[PDB]
Amino acid sequence: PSLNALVTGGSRGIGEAISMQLAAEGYSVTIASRGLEQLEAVKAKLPIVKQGQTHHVWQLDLSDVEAAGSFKGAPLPASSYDVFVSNAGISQFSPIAEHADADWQNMLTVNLTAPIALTKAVVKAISDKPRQTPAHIIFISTAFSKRGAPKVAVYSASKAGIDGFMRSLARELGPKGINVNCVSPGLVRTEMAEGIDPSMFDLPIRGWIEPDAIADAVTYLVKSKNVTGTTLSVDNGYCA
Amino acid sequence: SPSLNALVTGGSRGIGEAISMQLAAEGYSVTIASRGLEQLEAVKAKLPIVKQGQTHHVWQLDLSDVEAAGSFKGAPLPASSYDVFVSNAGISQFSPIAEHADADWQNMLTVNLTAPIALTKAVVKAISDKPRQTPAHIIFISTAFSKRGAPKVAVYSASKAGIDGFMRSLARELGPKGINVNCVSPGLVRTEMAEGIDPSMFDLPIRGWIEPDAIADAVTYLVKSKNVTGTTLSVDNGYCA
Amino acid sequence: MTSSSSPSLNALVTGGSRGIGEAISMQLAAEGYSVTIASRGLEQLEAVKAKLPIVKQGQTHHVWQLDLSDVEAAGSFKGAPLPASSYDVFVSNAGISQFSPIAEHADADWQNMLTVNLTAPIALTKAVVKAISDKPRQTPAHIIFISTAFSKRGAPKVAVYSASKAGIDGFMRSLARELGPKGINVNCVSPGLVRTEMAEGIDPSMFDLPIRGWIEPDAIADAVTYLVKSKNVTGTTLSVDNGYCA
Amino acid sequence: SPSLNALVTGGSRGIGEAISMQLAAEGYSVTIASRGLEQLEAVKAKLPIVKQGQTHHVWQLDLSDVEAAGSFKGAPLPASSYDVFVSNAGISQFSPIAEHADADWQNMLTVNLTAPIALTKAVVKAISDKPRQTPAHIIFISTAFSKRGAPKVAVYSASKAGIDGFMRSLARELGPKGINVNCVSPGLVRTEMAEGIDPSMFDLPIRGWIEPDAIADAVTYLVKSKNVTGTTLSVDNGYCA
């Protein structure tokens, strides 16, 4: 039977790479994002490999914390999902002093407040249901949230808060058959790079990290049942 | 031979009280900030004066107004006056995240992380380019639960781990600008934090409550230091061990 | 699509004759690696060798009787079926556990555990790193240490055990940095409590694990397979510990 | 006002000296242990006396000799005496692992890890069951390289990460017996680091070398604390930030 996976920020880059690999592993993938034009493009490319495997669009504004919390516009209930990948992701590069309040508070809503809400809703729905395999809550964090860089203060903070969430949730929901983990990318070839670039950091492993490599980690986790409370750093040796 | 100014959010009781006292005992001109003006004046009255030039202040500030925190609405002093800012204001809520009231945790998020970001920005916008013999100190009070997860305290841990994150980046951004940035991470301390939860309920290497004074010892040590930045001091009875 | 020569890569697994070792070898073998399994006990070695899949042309497995308490032997690749320069993957799983209040902990015991867990794998790694440092490659080599969750969250009565694997962690981070520009990715998989890798008076029930019970050795191998296929992961620990370090 | 006994290995030079000095400045009876005998007398001569019946002492010792450390061979006091032990026994070696001579990195391993384990085991043996008002302190000196990877320091890093694992475990083990166990993690410090590696090679939030005194600060703070165990105290100019 085709398990249901929710992947926020599934429109592009890492979320796409994730949604694809999950579809490829027989999962029914709901992607959630602002861009509908974009969702549909991506919906058609998701492999259908297992019979009964349907995919879904969710148009969702990632800064709407009541909508996320109330599953406003979701094609399926929160009770459905056996997997939730929190990849909702905006990054902003400014010195704290220059960093506009509209920006960093929006970032901090999108990267953390909405995820919490969305997570709450899911965990409410799926805690008491039976299952032989654990269900999976997996947050896409960032390398930056463990080792500090200049000019990514509020960004780092939003995703260190995520790391803190997962750690506690992992201990809270482990007896409920819910595994909770982060995957922590380093610098990836995407739309999370304006000024900032690999070269500006002396990496043990030079160059960009591709999305599909971030996905591999998600795929590994989803398939696991002994991994909770952990971060899987795919960061070319950034935090080493 | 001057008296430097210290700002200390949540200075009206508990950890922030113990810190403010010790700071004032070391000759800082402590401003305390919090919601309840009556409780403020009582601690201001309590703060020691051991130095001509030393002069303590109160700041009525609601911790959940970010415009207010951000702008310095109500401040005794200028932002640039501060050589030491201790972000100690926090809210703690024990709940299975399934029945965690939206308004409670969103509010706790604001108090714990959002507002301190805005306030921390004001202070940094002000004190960045200032000259100074020795370095300026931003010190957040996080919590042990930010580092080792615990059940039924997700959003709490999130907010304070969020702080840990902020401070790591800031330590890196503001090192050259002469500001050191660190966290002190208290465990269970004898205050009005959450409640119901006893030191019995975890397997602590050191049994018992932590006394708020002990936390202040960490802040005092940090503020007296030069080469410490990006670090958490854990005073947690070995909880994170 | 096709090729007239696709090569089998050489993997070395120390402590590969039972438990986690056994599991990893199995999994690397089924992925197409020519597996050299190494440890003291030759019967068990051969026993597993015969079980290792062969799924590929030009894939052969090997056995190395190696006394892991022997630093010199580890360092000089003494008795090794192949030279150090053969290996694209090296998995240091050689390890011992011991339980004791520090005060009751016999000197000959803990000292031997240190050699086995830290000293000798340093020696072994040096030999590999020297022999493969400057060999050209498009895909990275993998050095993987199997560590333990006790290296990162303290527990009573595993003092020298934790030190030893913690030393392996501090080793791994330094090398990841060192050898990353030489196309060598260096990592730790960190097992929590798994069946027959601890023994003698420590078990999951003594700890409030988010996930109760022992860990099957296959779970550890899943991590090691994942790493070995990875290209952008170095200087990290992958915890498989039923939530112990959380 | 009784003078408590403190053992400090590698107490003669650099960070050792600073630690020893500040301990004695606070009233502790110090035993500095090292191989160089003129250095011991030198430093012993300079240790402050501030407390009635405060006495200092030396113990000439090869910190590469694990049997001698383990048996307290030659020590001027029994293990039972000491309420404080600071394991600053240390050696750094910069080299490519491929080029790192067997004899060397194993001798480093012995001094950094093996010997302080034997030394720690001896202390814990002889003060585990003893009855105290304040907890005793076992404090290891580590390095920042033990938590952040840097090239050409693989075994140095490793050896001190061993010390990190050791103290975390021991904290959990001995907390209930009123032993607190932590590490102070120094970054790059004047005179302690093997020539070939220096602060300019890292984008430290704070530029430069660190004075040993700043290490001895973190120690002095731990020694006087009561609710801190299983922790690392980084004085590392933010290397690990």
Side-chain angles (χ1 to χ4, degrees), chain D residues 78-94:
Chain D
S80 49
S81 309
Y82 300 91
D83 294 275
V84 161
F85 161 59
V86 189
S87 177
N88 176 51
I91 276 182
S92 67
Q93 278 166 29
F94 169 89

PDB file of all heavy atoms in Angstrom, chain D residues 78-94:
ATOM      1  N   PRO D  78      49.336  11.480  49.118  1.00  0.00           N
ATOM      2  CA  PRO D  78      48.438  10.443  48.618  1.00  0.00           C
ATOM      3  C   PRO D  78      47.283  11.029  47.798  1.00  0.00           C
ATOM      4  O   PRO D  78      46.938  12.208  47.948  1.00  0.00           O
ATOM      5  CB  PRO D  78      47.866   9.809  49.897  1.00  0.00           C
ATOM      6  CG  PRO D  78      47.959  10.913  50.933  1.00  0.00           C
ATOM      7  CD  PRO D  78      49.245  11.636  50.581  1.00  0.00           C
ATOM      8  N   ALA D  79      46.669  10.182  46.974  1.00  0.00           N
ATOM      9  CA  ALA D  79      45.586  10.601  46.112  1.00  0.00           C
ATOM     10  C   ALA D  79      44.433  11.156  46.964  1.00  0.00           C
ATOM     11  O   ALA D  79      43.726  12.056  46.534  1.00  0.00           O
ATOM     12  CB  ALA D  79      45.160   9.445  45.238  1.00  0.00           C
ATOM     13  N   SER D  80      44.282  10.634  48.188  1.00  0.00           N
ATOM     14  CA  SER D  80      43.167  10.951  49.101  1.00  0.00           C
ATOM     15  C   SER D  80      43.084  12.454  49.412  1.00  0.00           C
ATOM     16  O   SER D  80      41.995  12.980  49.638  1.00  0.00           O
ATOM     17  CB  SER D  80      43.293  10.151  50.378  1.00  0.00           C
ATOM     18  OG  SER D  80      44.608  10.241  50.915  1.00  0.00           O
ATOM     19  N   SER D  81      44.246  13.118  49.431  1.00  0.00           N
ATOM     20  CA  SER D  81      44.412  14.523  49.810  1.00  0.00           C
ATOM     21  C   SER D  81      43.550  15.478  48.974  1.00  0.00           C
ATOM     22  O   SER D  81      43.074  16.476  49.510  1.00  0.00           O
ATOM     23  CB  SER D  81      45.849  14.929  49.695  1.00  0.00           C
ATOM     24  OG  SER D  81      46.672  14.009  50.374  1.00  0.00           O
ATOM     25  N   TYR D  82      43.386  15.193  47.674  1.00  0.00           N
ATOM     26  CA  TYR D  82      43.014  16.233  46.690  1.00  0.00           C
ATOM     27  C   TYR D  82      41.501  16.338  46.475  1.00  0.00           C
ATOM     28  O   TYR D  82      40.849  15.349  46.129  1.00  0.00           O
ATOM     29  CB  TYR D  82      43.704  15.976  45.353  1.00  0.00           C
ATOM     30  CG  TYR D  82      45.204  15.971  45.464  1.00  0.00           C
ATOM     31  CD1 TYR D  82      45.887  14.792  45.702  1.00  0.00           C
ATOM     32  CD2 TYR D  82      45.936  17.140  45.368  1.00  0.00           C
ATOM     33  CE1 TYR D  82      47.266  14.764  45.796  1.00  0.00           C
ATOM     34  CE2 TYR D  82      47.317  17.128  45.470  1.00  0.00           C
ATOM     35  CZ  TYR D  82      47.984  15.935  45.681  1.00  0.00           C
ATOM     36  OH  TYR D  82      49.341  15.879  45.778  1.00  0.00           O
ATOM     37  N   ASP D  83      40.999  17.573  46.631  1.00  0.00           N
ATOM     38  CA  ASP D  83      39.622  17.964  46.346  1.00  0.00           C
ATOM     39  C   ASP D  83      39.493  18.462  44.902  1.00  0.00           C
ATOM     40  O   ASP D  83      38.376  18.609  44.391  1.00  0.00           O
ATOM     41  CB  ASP D  83      39.165  19.021  47.350  1.00  0.00           C
ATOM     42  CG  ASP D  83      39.086  18.443  48.748  1.00  0.00           C
ATOM     43  OD1 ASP D  83      38.037  17.860  49.067  1.00  0.00           O
ATOM     44  OD2 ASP D  83      40.097  18.525  49.478  1.00  0.00           O
ATOM     45  N   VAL D  84      40.644  18.712  44.264  1.00  0.00           N
ATOM     46  CA  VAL D  84      40.737  19.250  42.917  1.00  0.00           C
ATOM     47  C   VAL D  84      41.911  18.596  42.191  1.00  0.00           C
ATOM     48  O   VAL D  84      42.993  18.406  42.749  1.00  0.00           O
ATOM     49  CB  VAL D  84      40.883  20.779  42.936  1.00  0.00           C
ATOM     50  CG1 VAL D  84      41.426  21.309  41.622  1.00  0.00           C
ATOM     51  CG2 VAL D  84      39.563  21.447  43.273  1.00  0.00           C
ATOM     52  N   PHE D  85      41.653  18.246  40.931  1.00  0.00           N
ATOM     53  CA  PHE D  85      42.641  17.724  40.017  1.00  0.00           C
ATOM     54  C   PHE D  85      42.378  18.351  38.643  1.00  0.00           C
ATOM     55  O   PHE D  85      41.277  18.276  38.102  1.00  0.00           O
ATOM     56  CB  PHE D  85      42.606  16.193  40.042  1.00  0.00           C
ATOM     57  CG  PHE D  85      43.241  15.507  38.856  1.00  0.00           C
ATOM     58  CD1 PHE D  85      44.573  15.719  38.538  1.00  0.00           C
ATOM     59  CD2 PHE D  85      42.512  14.623  38.074  1.00  0.00           C
ATOM     60  CE1 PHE D  85      45.152  15.066  37.461  1.00  0.00           C
ATOM     61  CE2 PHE D  85      43.092  13.990  36.988  1.00  0.00           C
ATOM     62  CZ  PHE D  85      44.412  14.205  36.689  1.00  0.00           C
ATOM     63  N   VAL D  86      43.400  19.017  38.110  1.00  0.00           N
ATOM     64  CA  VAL D  86      43.337  19.617  36.805  1.00  0.00           C
ATOM     65  C   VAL D  86      44.336  18.899  35.904  1.00  0.00           C
ATOM     66  O   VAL D  86      45.551  19.039  36.087  1.00  0.00           O
ATOM     67  CB  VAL D  86      43.626  21.122  36.882  1.00  0.00           C
ATOM     68  CG1 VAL D  86      43.354  21.805  35.555  1.00  0.00           C
ATOM     69  CG2 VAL D  86      42.824  21.760  37.999  1.00  0.00           C
ATOM     70  N   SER D  87      43.804  18.106  34.971  1.00  0.00           N
ATOM     71  CA  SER D  87      44.611  17.358  34.034  1.00  0.00           C
ATOM     72  C   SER D  87      44.958  18.278  32.849  1.00  0.00           C
ATOM     73  O   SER D  87      44.212  18.372  31.875  1.00  0.00           O
ATOM     74  CB  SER D  87      43.908  16.081  33.610  1.00  0.00           C
ATOM     75  OG  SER D  87      44.665  15.369  32.639  1.00  0.00           O
ATOM     76  N   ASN D  88      46.092  18.976  32.970  1.00  0.00           N
ATOM     77  CA  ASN D  88      46.628  19.816  31.903  1.00  0.00           C
ATOM     78  C   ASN D  88      47.865  19.166  31.261  1.00  0.00           C
ATOM     79  O   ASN D  88      48.488  19.769  30.402  1.00  0.00           O
ATOM     80  CB  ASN D  88      46.969  21.217  32.409  1.00  0.00           C
ATOM     81  CG  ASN D  88      47.608  22.074  31.339  1.00  0.00           C
ATOM     82  OD1 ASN D  88      47.083  22.188  30.231  1.00  0.00           O
ATOM     83  ND2 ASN D  88      48.759  22.646  31.654  1.00  0.00           N
ATOM     84  N   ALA D  89      48.201  17.937  31.671  1.00  0.00           N
ATOM     85  CA  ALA D  89      49.188  17.121  30.985  1.00  0.00           C
ATOM     86  C   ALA D  89      48.834  17.123  29.502  1.00  0.00           C
ATOM     87  O   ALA D  89      47.698  16.760  29.146  1.00  0.00           O
ATOM     88  CB  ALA D  89      49.180  15.719  31.539  1.00  0.00           C
ATOM     89  N   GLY D  90      49.787  17.555  28.668  1.00  0.00           N
ATOM     90  CA  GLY D  90      49.511  17.804  27.259  1.00  0.00           C
ATOM     91  C   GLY D  90      50.762  17.884  26.401  1.00  0.00           C
ATOM     92  O   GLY D  90      51.803  18.267  26.887  1.00  0.00           O
ATOM     93  N   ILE D  91      50.604  17.522  25.120  1.00  0.00           N
ATOM     94  CA  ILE D  91      51.603  17.584  24.054  1.00  0.00           C
ATOM     95  C   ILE D  91      50.860  17.751  22.720  1.00  0.00           C
ATOM     96  O   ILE D  91      49.987  16.956  22.424  1.00  0.00           O
ATOM     97  CB  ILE D  91      52.460  16.302  24.063  1.00  0.00           C
ATOM     98  CG1 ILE D  91      53.614  16.398  25.064  1.00  0.00           C
ATOM     99  CG2 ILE D  91      52.968  15.954  22.671  1.00  0.00           C
ATOM    100  CD1 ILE D  91      54.521  15.181  25.081  1.00  0.00           C
ATOM    101  N   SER D  92      51.191  18.776  21.927  1.00  0.00           N
ATOM    102  CA  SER D  92      50.629  18.921  20.551  1.00  0.00           C
ATOM    103  C   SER D  92      51.686  18.589  19.484  1.00  0.00           C
ATOM    104  O   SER D  92      52.858  18.871  19.645  1.00  0.00           O
ATOM    105  CB  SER D  92      50.074  20.293  20.328  1.00  0.00           C
ATOM    106  OG  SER D  92      51.118  21.253  20.323  1.00  0.00           O
ATOM    107  N   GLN D  93      51.248  17.980  18.382  1.00  0.00           N
ATOM    108  CA  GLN D  93      52.130  17.568  17.303  1.00  0.00           C
ATOM    109  C   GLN D  93      51.431  17.839  15.973  1.00  0.00           C
ATOM    110  O   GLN D  93      50.355  17.307  15.717  1.00  0.00           O
ATOM    111  CB  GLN D  93      52.475  16.086  17.398  1.00  0.00           C
ATOM    112  CG  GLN D  93      53.591  15.796  18.384  1.00  0.00           C
ATOM    113  CD  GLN D  93      53.691  14.332  18.721  1.00  0.00           C
ATOM    114  OE1 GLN D  93      53.359  13.461  17.922  1.00  0.00           O
ATOM    115  NE2 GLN D  93      54.149  14.058  19.928  1.00  0.00           N
ATOM    116  N   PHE D  94      52.069  18.679  15.154  1.00  0.00           N
ATOM    117  CA  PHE D  94      51.564  19.088  13.857  1.00  0.00           C
ATOM    118  C   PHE D  94      52.304  18.263  12.792  1.00  0.00           C
ATOM    119  O   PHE D  94      53.544  18.208  12.776  1.00  0.00           O
ATOM    120  CB  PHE D  94      51.688  20.612  13.742  1.00  0.00           C
ATOM    121  CG  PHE D  94      51.439  21.184  12.369  1.00  0.00           C
ATOM    122  CD1 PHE D  94      50.161  21.549  11.971  1.00  0.00           C
ATOM    123  CD2 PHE D  94      52.489  21.379  11.479  1.00  0.00           C
ATOM    124  CE1 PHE D  94      49.938  22.077  10.708  1.00  0.00           C
ATOM    125  CE2 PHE D  94      52.262  21.903  10.216  1.00  0.00           C
ATOM    126  CZ  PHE D  94      50.986  22.251   9.831  1.00  0.00           C
TER     127      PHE D  94
END
